[PDB]
């Protein structure tokens, strides 16, 4: 590396709530309610009716120490730096009697020299945490105004003023819990003669034949004299150089800037999921002085390139993904952050997620405005995942402040961010917010605002996403695409508008459309639609009691936090299904009914290739137990919904879709290769496992790489008769022409609740060694959406939510580190049957 040191400011951290005089331990990185709670100072915030009880954390100041020691050699280094990587948010700090820093802005890192305020041995540091509503109020004050935050759960909407995460004042799927602290690690670097401020690796050009490299470093030089140096930059892969270069320089005090061409001759590009590996490179910058490495910085780099394309056409204006020259159709989520408390996420945590979103076969996640510029690691396993990254910037939903002050500390966390985050491979393009134009153009602000204030509030709106935030990606990211909003024209009420750019369609669930809506309503590209459901009972029994089991109770109308709630649950559950008269039976159909209405949508936009180019459903994830749109609940758990997004993203499908009593088949590819001479095989089954007719064979089919298209068009009428539509299904198979299968999907003709479905015992066997349960099920007729359900929070299944079918038997394998050999995990199986008589 090089010979620096650097000291983590980790441990030995005390609190106090300020006024009291009474400090106790704390952990550092943290927060104040996850310090309270480690002292039983507050209850489980997520737990039934106590979001209203941690409310007064937010009233108070709170105050942060801890010391260190600091040698005589340390405190003879060059120069010492005092790094926070995130403070949270009105904070000072103070350092030996020194005031260094008053921080302003949560998504700030704070880089401070302070060599000269160090002493040796004891050192000590003090951090006073302002409430950000304190702070605020006399700003609110001032303002003649209150911004129509409807997220901000609080009559004052305090939260436009600060920058700090949007979603931590409250959210539609988000408890409040307006927390302080220091919310990324502290260190403290010893070292000789300068630092690498920054080092970008800029990509001028990239063929199948060369890439055509710039590195651009900063150094910051902290000695009085001029100092001769050799800047290096290695170029590796699997620990082998590709390339070498170096400059002679001589560094001056202050500032450097220093740029080396590098080649990389016949480069291996990094692919997006699906269509290869995510090839990552080691590019090591390195400062030489005389024998020693006094500086060096690193990146993985991932050559490739993404070109957006957002262009008039005949259909309205495009807006889709060029992946090193190849369009690709995006599949994946909105991202929110993974808890009400963020440095209670941990790095396990990253990693099963990008798990969760790579076995699912997402290829894109949208790194939505109302949560935070995520952490390295994040984008770390996005580029080891070939996961594309949408970054809105964080303002979400409101209209904000634009006077000079305010767009300051913005400017300060663009030019952060972007040169913290534009080295990753994954990152794709910029979006300005979620949703402000759309606020501003279709909730009528003209007649809950003056003229003036209005005025304002539009001239606002282009200082900081028309102006500002594309002027800093121009200057800091050039070769990125930037969008001042998500949406940026289509709103899901104008029918007229969904052929220009990306769409919020949320006519299902908001405006109560059914999903039978998804197939006719298509965008150009879906950067969010959704469905909720309560999250399954293992869930529920972790912020419920037994007599909260009603779905408009207070404690489940506690953890619905949408402008429409639990009861639509049911109303949508009433078209497709039979409503079971037992809660727990409701959640699982409820699980059933979001995953099959949305894999619905999700079929459509991909069927709908090239006019539709992506679809991101709200949302991945969740930030507590709650009833949300989430596909993976707030303890791991895969819903319904991430099992049918996992099939409905599969690179090949075959996409029955039915309408007005007609039958068409869909191949949808991905892939980067065209199958040839391939075969389509159906047949009718009933419920018994018997076959109605005959097969069906459509024989020497084509599926282009990269392609929707349909091979297969019937009737039903002359078919099938009513009577089979409700007994039957179709089985569908699509094989190669020596006969092995590459896809296979099943087709029910008739909704759910109108299914004659057999009652049916499900029986499995079971094999279960440490960390893994082997399950082998079997049903001598159908059982529907069955849904294996075990108490073990997390435990992972191979499948789940699927028909089990008439005398086929399915194996399942589910996995947790807490399966013990010889300790029999709980299974209980659901199927749609079971839930009524
Ligand atoms: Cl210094
Ligand atoms: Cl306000
Ligand atoms: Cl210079």
Not at 5 to 10: C, K
Not at 284 to 298: K, N, T
Not at 766 to 792: H, R, V, Y
Not at 800 to 820: H, Q
């Amino acid at each position: 590396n090089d010979t620096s040191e650097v000291m983590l400011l980790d441990t030995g951290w005390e609190f106090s709530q300020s006024g009291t005089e009474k400090w106790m331990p704390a952990t550092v990185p943290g927060t104040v309610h996850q310090d309270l709670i480690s002292h039983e100072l507050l209850p489980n915030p997520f737990y039934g009716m106590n979001e209203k009880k941690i409310q007064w954390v937010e009233n108070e100041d709170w105050e942060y120490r801890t010391s260190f020691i600091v040698s005589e050699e340390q405190l003879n280094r060059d120069g010492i730096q005092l790094i926070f990587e995130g403070l949270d948010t009105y904070a000072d700090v103070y350092l030996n009697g020194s005031l260094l820093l008053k921080a302003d802005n949560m998504f700030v890192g704070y880089t401070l020299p302070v060599k000269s305020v160090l002493r040796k041995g004891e050192n000590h540091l003090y951090i006073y945490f302002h409430s950000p509503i304190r702070q605020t109020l006399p700003q609110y004050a001032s303002n003649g105004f209150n911004y129509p935050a409807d997220n901000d759960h609080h009559e004052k909407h305090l939260s436009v003023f600060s920058r700090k995460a949007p979603y931590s004042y409250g959210w539609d799927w988000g408890i409040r819990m307006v927390t302080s602290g220091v919310w990324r690690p502290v260190t403290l670097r010893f070292y000789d003669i300068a630092t690498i401020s920054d080092y970008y690796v800029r990509q001028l050009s990239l063929t199948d034949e060369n890439a055509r490299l710039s590195n651009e470093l900063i150094v910051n030089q902290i000695v009085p004299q001029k100092i001769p140096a050799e800047v290096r930059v290695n170029v590796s892969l699997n620990g082998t150089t590709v390339t070498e270069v170096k400059q002679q320089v001589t560094l001056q005090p202050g500032i450097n800037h220093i740029t080396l061409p590098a080649e990389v001759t016949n480069p291996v590009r990094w692919m997006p999921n699906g269509w290869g590996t995510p090839t990552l490179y080691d590019f090591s910058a390195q400062i030489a002085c005389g024998d020693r490495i006094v500086a060096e910085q690193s990146h993985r780099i991932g050559l490739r390139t993404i070109r957006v394309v957002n262009e008039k056409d005949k259909d309205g204006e495009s807006f889709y993904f060029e992946v090193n020259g190849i369009p690709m159709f995006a599949k994946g989520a909105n991202y929110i952050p993974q808890d009400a408390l963020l440095p209670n996420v941990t790095t396990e945590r990253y990693q099963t997620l990008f798990r969760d979103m790579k076995e699912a076969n997402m290829n894109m996640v949208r790194i939505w405005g109302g949560g935070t510029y995520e952490n390295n690691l994040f984008y770390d396993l996005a580029d080891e995942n070939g996961i594309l990254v949408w970054q809105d910037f964080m303002f979400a939903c409101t209209p904000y402040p634009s006077d000079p002050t305010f767009l300051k500390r913005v400017e300060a966390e663009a030019v952060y961010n972007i040169r913290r985050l534009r080295n990753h491979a994954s990152l794709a393009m910029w979006c300005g917010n979620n949703e402000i134009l759309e606020a501003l153009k279709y909730w009528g602000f003209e007649k809950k605002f003056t003229p003036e204030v209005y005025q304002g509030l539009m001239h606002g709106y282009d200082k900081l996403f028309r102006e500002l935030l594309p002027s800093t990606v121009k200057e800091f990211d050039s070769d990125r695409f930037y969008v001042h909003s998500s949406p940026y024209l289509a709103n899901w009420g104008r029918p007229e508008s969904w052929g220009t750019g990306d769409s919020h369609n949320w006519g299902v669930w908001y405006g109560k459309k059914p999903f039978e809506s998804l197939d006719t309503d298509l965008p150009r590209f879906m950067s969010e639609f959704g469905f909720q459901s309560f999250p399954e009972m293992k869930t529920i029994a972790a912020f419920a009691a037994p007599e909260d089991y009603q779905i408009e109770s207070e404690v489940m109308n506690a953890h619905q936090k949408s402008s429409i709630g639990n009861s639509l649950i049911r109303t949508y559950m009433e078209r497709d299904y039979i409503i079971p008269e037992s809660f727990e039976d409701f959640v699982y159909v409820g699980l059933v009914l979001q995953g099959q209405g949305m894999r619905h949508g999700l079929e459509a936009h991909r069927r709908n290739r090239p006019y539709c180019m992506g679809t991101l459903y709200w949302q991945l994830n969740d930030s507590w137990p709650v009833v949300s749109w989430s596909s993976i609940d707030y303890y791991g758990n895969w819903k319904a919904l991430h099992y049918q997004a996992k099939r409905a993203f599969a690179p090949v499908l075959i996409n029955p879709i039915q309408q007005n009593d007609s039958l068409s088949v869909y191949l949808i590819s991905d892939r980067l290769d065209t199958m040839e001479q391939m075969t389509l095989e159906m047949k009718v089954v009933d419920f018994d496992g018997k076959t109605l007719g005959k097969k069906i064979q459509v024989h020497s089919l084509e599926v282009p790489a990269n392609t929707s298209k349909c091979v297969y068009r019937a009737k039903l009428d002359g078919w099938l008769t009513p009577e089979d539509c409700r007994r039957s299904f179709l089985k569908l198979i699509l094989k190669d022409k020596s006969g092995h299968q590459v896809a296979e999907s099943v087709h029910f003709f008739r909704k759910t609740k109108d299914l004659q479905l057999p009652p049916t015992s499900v029986s499995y066997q079971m094999k279960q060694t440490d960390g893994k349960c082997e399950l082998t099920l079997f049903s001598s007729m159908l059982a529907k959406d069955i849904f294996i359900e075990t108490p073990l929070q997390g435990a992972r299944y191979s499948d789940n939510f699927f028909d089990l079918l008439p005398g086929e038997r399915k194996k399942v394998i589910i996995t947790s580190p807490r399966i013990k050999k010889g300790e029999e995990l709980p299974v209980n199986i659901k199927h749609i049957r079971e839930t009524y008589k």
